[PDB]
Design a protein around this ligand. Structure first.
Ligand SMILES: COCCOCCOCCOc1ccc(C(C)(C)CC(C)(C)C)cc1
Ligand SMILES: COCCOCCOCCOc1ccc(C(C)(C)CC(C)(C)C)cc1
Ligand SMILES: COCCOCCOCCOc1ccc(C(C)(C)CC(C)(C)C)cc1
Length: 265
């Protein structure tokens, strides 16, 4: 249980240096790229915290992160938000202002606001990557992980058509062992009945990384979603203070302010 205690330290604690040294030596040895991603303490700590300072797992995650980036150029080859600013303006995606009861950052995606005649699955994936790279900078998010809510109202066949076996593989990767964020929960709301039926059959065979972390609320989601996310949801989902539009505009603004950092990858 040393791991979670190391996670709880600030980045400048000398106690994190043994793990950082051990990981940086493994990275260097396997010939990790020099390409505009510096192996700073703060960067490397993301991987250590994601795997509670288990060095072998932090290293495997780091390698898989590099592998995933190399394997998905149409997502990862340019992180400047200029390519997806329409999706953001359309209201596809926002991050809640407040954390949930266990301190997780909460992400919301709205499928009705993705026009598949305009944006590909890879554009939409680029949105998640951008957000991920931003939120991972907060040490509390590294410690407490994330939850994502997918509002599937208006899910159409044109959306489903974009999820090929290749896209499915890339989705599983980022949820499991290819990005330095702990996915503590995946919530679907307003999703078609077919999701439940499939899930009831495949659930027992899923990786334990996600198996017990998937919650499908269906159309009657208000009460159940509220139990997981009290006092932090937008008006549209049963919250009290701000609209989803406010959240989307606030997150969009933050992305644009970070445009040079995003490019610098
Ligand atoms: C889920 O089914 C709907 C299909 O949506 C389109 C597919 O592209 C969405 C990719 O979604 C994610 C979700 C989470 C993540 C990670 C695990 C990196 C965490 C996050 C959301 C904080 C970025 C990455 C991509
Ligand atoms: C072709 O359908 C694309 C819909 O994608 C939903 C987003 O999540 C992607 C995860 O991967 C799957 C898994 C199963 C399925 C279906 C519904 C087609 C079930 C199946 C193929 C196992 C019978 C679709 C996507
Ligand atoms: C009828 O609508 C047309 C398109 O149909 C899309 C298929 O929807 C059913 C898909 O069912 C699932 C259920 C679970 C999953 C897993 C658990 C693998 C991944 C998850 C949680 C990201 C959806 C994938 C597909």
């Amino acid at each position: 249980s040393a791991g979670p205690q190391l996670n709880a330290l600030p980045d400048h604690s000398p106690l994190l240096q043994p793990g950082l040294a051990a990981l940086r030596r493994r990275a260097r040895e396997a010939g990790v790229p020099l390409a505009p991603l510096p192996l700073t303490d703060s960067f490397l700590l993301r991987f250590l915290r994601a795997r509670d300072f288990d060095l072998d797992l932090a290293w495997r995650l780091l390698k898989n992160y590099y592998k995933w980036r190399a394997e998905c150029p149409e997502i990862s080859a340019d992180l400047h938000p200029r390519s997806i600013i329409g999706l953001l303006k359309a209201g596809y995606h926002g991050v809640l202002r407040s954390r949930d009861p266990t301190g997780s950052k909460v992400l919301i995606y709205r499928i009705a606001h993705w026009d598949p005649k305009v944006f590909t699955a890879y554009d939409v994936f680029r949105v998640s990557l951008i957000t991920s790279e931003l939120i991972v900078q907060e040490v509390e998010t590294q410690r407490n992980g994330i939850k994502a809510i997918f509002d599937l109202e208006g899910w159409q066949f044109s959306h489903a058509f974009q999820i090929t076996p290749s896209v499915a593989k890339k989705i599983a990767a980022v949820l499991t062992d290819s990005f330095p964020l702990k996915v503590r929960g995946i919530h679907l709301i307003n999703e078609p009945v077919i999701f439940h039926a499939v899930f009831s059959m495949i659930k027992p065979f899923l990786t334990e990384k996600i198996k017990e972390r998937i919650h499908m609320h269906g159309n009657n989601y208000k009460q159940s979603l509220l139990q997981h996310f009290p006092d932090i949801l937008p008006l549209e989902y049963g919250g009290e203070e701000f609209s989803m539009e406010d959240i989307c505009q606030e997150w969009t603004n933050f992305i644009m302010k970070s445009e040079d950092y995003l490019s610098s990858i």
